Amino acid sequence: VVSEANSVIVILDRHGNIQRFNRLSEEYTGLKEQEVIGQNVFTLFMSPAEASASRRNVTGFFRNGSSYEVERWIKTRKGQRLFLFRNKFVHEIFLICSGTDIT
Ligand SMILES: CCCCCCCCCCCC(=O)O
């Protein structure tokens, strides 16, 4: 393998359903992209409190959002890890979430 990425890159629709899920996301979670496409990111990867906040953010973003950053605790194969997500529309029906593990 020539190189590796440094970010967890997840693309979502307005419902939080997953459209793409990169290799580092697979490494953190133990789940393959093919296993998670169409699945809901909030219920799959967040505690109830984080999911509720995150779902409201995404729904609000699709209404009138500008690109933004947020910190989210995420359930991984070694417990919860904190990520900075840089979120923006595709250059709109999909949201690109560009995450760094900031734990
Ligand atoms: C480790 C990969 C799995 C986590 C992907 C989560 C997507 C984050 C969406 C955050 C939106 C928000 O809370 O404002």
Author numbering: 116 to 206, 213 to 224
Task: Show the paper's wording.
DSFs are a family of fatty acid AIs produced and detected by a wide range of gram-negative bacteria, including important pathogens. The DSF receptor RpfR is conserved in numerous gram-negative bacteria, including, among others, Escherichia coli, B. cenocepacia, Cronobacter turicensis, Serratia marcescens, Yersinia enterocolitica, and Enterobacter cloacae. RpfR was predicted to contain three domains, namely Per-Arnt-Sim (PAS), diguanylate cyclase (DGC), and phosphodiesterase (PDE) domains. BDSF binding to RpfR was previously shown to trigger its PDE activity, decreasing the intracellular concentration of c-di-GMP and favoring biofilm dispersal.
Without adding fatty acid to the crystallization experiment, we observed prominent electron density in the PAS domain core that was consistent with a 12-carbon fatty acid ligand. Intriguingly, even when an excess of BDSF was included during crystallization, the electron density was consistent with a fatty acid that did not contain a cis-2 double bond. These data suggested that RpfRCt(PAS) copurified with a tightly bound fatty acid likely originating from the E. coli overexpression host. Indeed, using liquid chromatography–mass spectrometry (LC-MS), we determined that the ligand is the saturated isomer of BDSF, C12:0, which E. coli is known to produce endogenously. Thus, we built and refined the 1.5 Å resolution X-ray crystal structure of RpfRCt(PAS)–C12:0. In the RpfRCt(PAS)–C12:0 structure, the C12:0 carboxylic acid group forms multiple hydrogen bonds with a set of conserved hydrophilic residues (S169, N172, Y183, and R187) at one end of the ligand-binding pocket. At the other end of the pocket, the C12:0 hydrophobic acyl tail is surrounded by conserved hydrophobic residues. While C12:0 is an inactive isomer of BDSF, the RpfRCt(PAS)–C12:0 structure provided the first insight into how fatty acids interact with RpfR and proved to be important for comparative analysis. Comparison of the RpfRCt(PAS)–BDSF and RpfRCt(PAS)–C12:0 structures reveals that the ligands adopt different conformations, resulting from the absence or presence of the cis-2 double bond in C12:0 or BDSF, respectively. BDSF was shown to tightly bind RpfRBc (Kd = 877 nM), while C12:0 (Kd = 800 μM) and trans-2 dodecenoic acid (Kd = 150 μM) were found to weakly interact with the receptor. We propose that the more electron rich N202 amide nitrogen interacts with the electron deficient Cβ of BDSF. This interaction cannot occur for the fully saturated C12:0 and would be significantly weaker for trans-2 dodecenonic acid because its Cβ would be suboptimally positioned further away from N202.
